[PDB]
Amino acid sequence: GTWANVNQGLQGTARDILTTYWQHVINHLESDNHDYKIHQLLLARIKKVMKADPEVKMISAEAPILFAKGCDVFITELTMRAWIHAEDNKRRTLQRSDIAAALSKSDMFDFLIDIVP
Amino acid sequence: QDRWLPIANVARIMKLALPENAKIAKEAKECMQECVSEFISFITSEASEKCQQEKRKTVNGEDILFAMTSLGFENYAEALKIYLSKY
């Protein structure tokens, strides 16, 4: 149900590792002492992405801070999914075709079909 | 440009996701930048339309989470829910 996306389209050890990565993400978010001042330059730039959409007017301080954490998880999990394809071709350099291959294993990534055709 | 997160921050997160001895192609970094930037823009647009339809001016944390749930990022919504209530 709620964690279907954690290992959708993964088989074997990749499945256990992405699952253990999400457990590690959740324990971190469940911790009591969060430092909510990530660099003012990054939060300024997150907000400028949000404000590029004309429909957006005012943004709560809460929103960029959610995306900072969310974007760290997204990059980490997609990089780990993409690494699988580099390891299978006996490569140590991650290529664009490894990100493309990774996107095609889960329909969670369907929103990126024009970004990575 | 405003459409994209700065690439150094993106490259740093990617480097931490890979084995210590792994390399990252320039094209792989640039691709991940476009992806995570659309991730923001995609969720934000769904949150932004719900706000307009309900005549509200500010987009808040619970709108980002509601948009993540409706767009099929349920794991992201439930994990960040815990984080939002501490803030």
Binding site: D110 | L71, G72
Partner: peptide
């Protein structure tokens, strides 16, 4: 190559982002 049906939770937002991205690109130019 190009599928008719994609993620049922994402399709409508994908169509709208295609429109919003086209505007940005035509307003950029």
């Amino acid at each position: 190559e190009s599928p008719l049906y994609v993620n049922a939770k994402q399709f409508h937002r994908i169509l709208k982002r295609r429109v919003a991205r086209q505007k940005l690109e035509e307003q950029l130019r």
